[PDB]
């Protein structure tokens, strides 16, 4: 679920998902167009694609379980959708961690009109 993803994001990064990642660039928290602004935004682009891979799942609301094994996220077995949603979220949270070094606040609240063009998953 979105709340679980937000908790994972905070755990990884130390940033609150709202506001740090909910309106960032072209693809985070919202959006389907544009060239991603930076690596963090590309995490979001890929995450959006990952959810798009799951048209008969409900990633915003369906809950999954995960644990940590020496820091590492391990998604525990639930339904098929839950497992796949968890793997999408895990990847994005790791990606955000891997790209903190370039996170930029100037991309929070990024205006929609600066995001144009489709980029295929």
């Amino acid at each position: 679920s979105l709340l679980e993803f937000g908790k994972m994001i905070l755990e990884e990064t130390g940033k609150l998902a709202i506001p740090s990642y909910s309106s960032y660039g072209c693809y985070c928290g919202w959006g389907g167009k544009g060239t991603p602004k930076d690596a963090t935004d590309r995490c979001c682009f890929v995450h959006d694609c990952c959810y798009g891979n799951l048209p008969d799942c409900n990633p915003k609301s369906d809950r999954y379980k995960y644990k940590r094994v020496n820091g590492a996220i391990v998604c525990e077995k639930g339904t098929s959708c839950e497992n796949r949603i968890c793997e999408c979220d895990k990847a994005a949270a790791i990606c955000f961690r891997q790209n903190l070094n370039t996170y930029s606040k100037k991309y929070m609240l990024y205006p929609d009109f600066l995001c144009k063009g489709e980029l295929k998953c």
Binding site: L3, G6, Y21, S22, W30, C44, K60
Partner: peptide, 4 residues
């Protein structure tokens, strides 16, 4: 929360 985000959207995605």
């Amino acid at each position: 929360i985000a959207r995605s």
